[PDB]
Design a protein around this ligand. Structure first.
Ligand SMILES: O=C1CC[C@@H](CCC(=O)N2CCC(COc3ccc(F)cc3Cl)CC2)N1
Ligand SMILES: [Cl-]
Length: 285
């Protein structure tokens, strides 16, 4: 019996790769016609999948970039227990595998990363693991940072039952655009389950690792952040601008905006799209 997605579609029918753990990841490509100027991997966030970057990805392909992506393990059309991972580094390992593959097939080309939220944390750790290799990083409200005993309490019963959950990601604080909160609450590829303690700990490892990595980054980046984000605190973006050694770093703050700036009120989203577009054009031209 052919291996199937968690939505029972056979992987022989979809673009895919197999990770070091023997798991199938669903892959997604937007290739320009004629020869590409650069490569860019798009790294999605927690609960979501590659499909949510359709718009951004089409805009990047339109600047003649080869845009590729995959669903992280335990997300989207990829394999694994939903929103669980053996160590956060699996995600980074899997991005590097996909990047190394794409580079083999398009040698010469600069490679960029775009990440949102958890996908931004993965973007940072990926660049930090191959210092000097990435041409640029586009970070949309990356996970860079919530109490002390809830931290200490987690790893206590991470031994007992780590399959206990806290609340789901609260969808009302995702975007002031209610159409996009509706779309989020409707997408059958989005896992809206509670946050498992075991996943909660990996997210804490990620935060911890990202903070140790910040002082070591040199990669150019564009950092977009909402001031009223209840999921990834604005202070994290300020901290990344403080600690990164990158000679080429830009912060744009969207006053009042929630977490998902690429799916916000259209004044914000159109700005987000325009800024990413200008910043990538200037660095591929
Ligand atoms: O378009 C979209 C749809 C989905 C959204 C992205 C969501 C995403 O990736 N999140 C948001 C929640 C954040 C929770 O963080 C923690 C939770 C518990 C914990 F114990 C320690 C941490 Cl650090 C992690 C990252 N954007
Ligand atoms: Cl890691």
């Amino acid at each position: 019996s052919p291996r199937r997605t968690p939505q029972s579609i056979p992987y022989q029918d979809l673009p895919h790769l197999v990770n070091a753990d023997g798991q199938y990841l669903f892959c997604r490509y937007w290739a320009p016609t004629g020869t590409p100027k650069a490569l860019i991997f798009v790294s999605h966030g927690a609960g979501e999948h590659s499909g949510r970057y359709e718009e951004l990805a089409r805009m990047l392909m339109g600047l003649d970039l080869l845009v590729f992506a995959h669903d992280h393990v335990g997300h989207g059309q990829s394999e694994g227990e939903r929103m669980v991972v053996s160590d956060f580094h699996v995600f980074v390992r899997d991005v590097l595998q996909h990047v190394d593959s794409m580079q083999k097939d398009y040698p010469g080309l600069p490679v960029f990363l775009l990440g949102h939220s958890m996908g931004g944390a993965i973007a940072i750790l990926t660049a930090a693991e191959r210092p000097g290799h990435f041409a640029g990083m586009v970070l949309i409200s990356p996970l860079v940072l919530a109490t002390t005993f809830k931290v200490l309490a987690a790893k206590v019963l991470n031994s007992v039952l780590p399959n206990l959950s806290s609340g789901p990601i609260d969808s009302s604080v995702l975007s002031r655009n209610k159409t996009e909160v509706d779309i989020y609450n409707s997408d059958p590829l989005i896992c809206r389950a509670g946050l498992k303690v075991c996943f909660g700990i990996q997210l804490l490892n990620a935060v911890s690792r990202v903070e140790r990595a910040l002082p070591k980054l040199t990669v150019p980046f564009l950092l977009l952040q909402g001031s009223a984000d209840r999921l990834c605190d604005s202070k994290g973006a300020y901290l990344l601008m403080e600690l990164a050694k990158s000679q080429d770093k830009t912060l744009k703050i969207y006053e009042g905006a929630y977490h998902v700036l690429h799916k916000e009120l259209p004044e914000v989203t159109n700005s987000v799209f325009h800024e990413i577009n200008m910043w990538v054009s200037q660095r591929t031209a």
